[model samples]
Target: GDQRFGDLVFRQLAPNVWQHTSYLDMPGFGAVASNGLIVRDGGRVLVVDTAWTDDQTAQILNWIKQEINLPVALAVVTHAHGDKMGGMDALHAAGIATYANALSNQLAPQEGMVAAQHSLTFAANGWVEPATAPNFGPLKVFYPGPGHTSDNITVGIDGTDIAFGGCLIKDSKAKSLGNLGDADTEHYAASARAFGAAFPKASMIVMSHSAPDSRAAITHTARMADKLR
Candidate 1:
């Protein structure tokens, strides 16, 4: 069953998986919707990204508690941008351990943002973790390097074969790369290519601001990334 709170909507995509879409005000873009994922496994709840404000995130937290009846073990912020990390304080207030790439943390304050308390360095922790790192319950964080942002990363859910591309991979319907204010445009294509090569068989991929799909999303993003000069 799907549920709505304010401009947020929770729709189930599969067993134990739900898509959370939150509509919020963007500085230049006006009111727009951002996407996130809710995954329940092994009696634990894992959220990827959060809404644009504390109130919006509070709604999500309430829903999880009243509906799923499980505690959020972890939450991952896809990037340091406000849209991605705005609800971070809400998560922390809920006593949830939030994680993000060190680069994301490093770029946060410069962007007028607060970095996640728990930061994982790719060259250190991620690369050293075993392939089956149960960090996010079989979902491994992978940094493709400098596409949408220097810290953009993806979460690969093992059993589901689904990848949460965050803002790194564009939606299939996207004509151009969405936001490039903090992007490495020159190397975007190369980064996307590396991502595809890293997870070639990701059948269902979810983007932060668009619909989910198999391969078209990544293909579309890769094409756009290459087209940029």
Candidate 2:
């Protein structure tokens, strides 16, 4: 099922789960990229997220179809950024359910206009709207009061022992919390605390922009948030 683009290198951090990452060149977006995850639950394969454009996401899906006969159960979008949810249009066309915070539909269009326009351009070519509400599995979309963007939502895969950090904090020596000019610092701090309280068992933090590392990644980000508080 490794589509025409070939097999994507999959990183397995837990049993029955795999994620695919793609780096694409987009003019103003710099190096636009996306991460996709495939999870096998009760003998069915579920795709967690899709990438930048339809073609790119297709590559990931092709891998799934080749490897697993199960249709995509759902596609989780960690944030409303184009790199995170732009491929929803394509996934919807393929009959996959897509999940994002309710806040995403309301605020994303206004705050993330660039991403909306980007997705629309592709959707116009032939795409479907995804199924809504009552998510497909045990995952949760924790909207931690916006550290990266108002539409930012952290996707937590319950059984994976991993929390996908969608640009909330970059794991690098840039060593300083990037300016979150548009978010509520106090709320962001509260959200970080909530995540800590809820996922005491988190073993790794898989970041969208950086490599996956220790659960300290969350605590480390919390420390940075404390500074803003």
Candidate 3:
């Protein structure tokens, strides 16, 4: 099932999982579509990331409340990049609490953005257990090294075979590593493999800057990243 909110479209992948796609235009990248997730966990909603700008993200925030009829418990931003958290101001002003890697806060200003309301810590290799944050319910957040950005994280939605890969995992349309300016290509391949290892059960991957895809998309990213090595 798919619903609309202005230019944004929410596609329900499962009973409780909805993928949100929004647009952004960068200097070199003329127009970009960023993908995020809206998952209804228990009585509250969990957002994966925000839109490209404050107003864009505001649309997402409003759409969630209008459709789900439940308050958003929290949002987990995948990285410090503005494409993922540019709407930090809107989310904070809306009184929506957020959870993100501590490094996201430290690097937010570099991208002309502010940090999330809360910080989460991940152990070695950046893999966090489900119990790491009970509020997340069945969603597992994993920081699979530095692929897209040093702090990029991927969310694996348990029981749904779906994962939010943020900017790290590319869809089939991406020809190259895409944006390497703020990226750490040295760990790109390693990070892609880490993503595959963490979400072995995930068949559908919700990604930013491209369409949703399967595990093959992650494999495609790993293959491309490896060729660069």
Best-performing candidate as measured by TM-score? 3
Model 3 residue runs over 4 Å out of place are: 26-28, 129-134
lDDT per residue as tens, model 2, 1-229: 2223453356776777776777777676576445556787775666655676677778777877777777777666666666666576677778776666555555556645222221110022111123433434655555555576665666567777876666675553337555365666766666665555555677776766666777676767777777877
Q: Between 2 and 3, whose lDDT is larger?
A: 3
lDDT of 1 by residue, 1-229 (tens): 6688656888887788888888877598777878888899879999988887888988889888877999899988888887788888899899998887777888888866778877766653224144323357856678787889888877777677678888888877887788888899898988787777767778888888787887888888898888885
What local lDDT score does residue 156 receive in model 3, on the 0 to 100 scale?
92
Which candidate leads the pack in lDDT? 3
Name the candidate, 1 or 2, with the larger lDDT value. 1
C-alpha root-mean-square deviation, each candidate: 2.4, 7.5, 1.7
User: In terms of TM-score, how similar is model 2 to the real structure?
Assistant: 0.75
**Candidate 3 TM-score over all chains jointly:** 0.94
Write the number of the candidate with greater TM-score, choosing between 1 and 3. 3
- Taken over the whole model, the C-alpha lDDT of each candidate is 0.80, 0.61, 0.85
